[PDB]
Amino acid sequence: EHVAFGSEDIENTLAKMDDGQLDGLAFGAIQLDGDGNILQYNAAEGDITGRDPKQVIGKNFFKDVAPCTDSPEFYGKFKEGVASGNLNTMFEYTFDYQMTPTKVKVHMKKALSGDSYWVFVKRV
Numbered sequence: 807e808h809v810a811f812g813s814e815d816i817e818n819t820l821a822k823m824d825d826g827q828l829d830g831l832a833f834g835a836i837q838l839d840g841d842g843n844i845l846q847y848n849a850a851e852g853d854i855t856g857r858d859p860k861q862v863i864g865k866n867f868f869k870d871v872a873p874c875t876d877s878p879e880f881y882g883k884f885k886e887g888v889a890s891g892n893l894n895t896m897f898e899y900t901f902d903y904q905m906t907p908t909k910v911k912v913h914m915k916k917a918l919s920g921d922s923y924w925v926f927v928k929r930v
């Protein structure tokens with residue numbers, strides 16, 4: 807249905823969704839495996855970043871797609887949460903690789919499905 811950015815049970819709602827449904831979200835949604843490889847990437851995210859969602863699948867988010875996020879402030883928090891098993895964290899960030907510098911709010915949250923982690927993004 808409608809689901810809001812930052813919802814307490816967002817991972818429950820998104821677990822139920824196909825590509826088209828993920829594409830209809832109000833916010834960018836990326837699913838990563840524990841190594842940061844991109845499993846899913848929705849249309850809303852591509853509208854923020856200019857990436858083609860169909861072609862970033864399989865790439866590594868931190869190494870290749872989003873090098874500006876390779877930092878203790880973003881990637882560091884991702885890996886801490888993958889390790890702890892309790893990934894659920896929110897912060898502001900600026901995305902600026904091969905796009906106009908864009909201020910965003912990011913929410914990372916463990917998925918219900920195996921070896922899966924969400925990165926949610928909205929403009930601020």
Ligand SMILES: *C(=O)/C=C/c1ccc(O)cc1
Binds near residue numbers: 857871874903
């Ligand atoms: C910094 O390099 C961020 C880049 C970026 C963030 C999010 C995406 O979906 C794509 C590229």
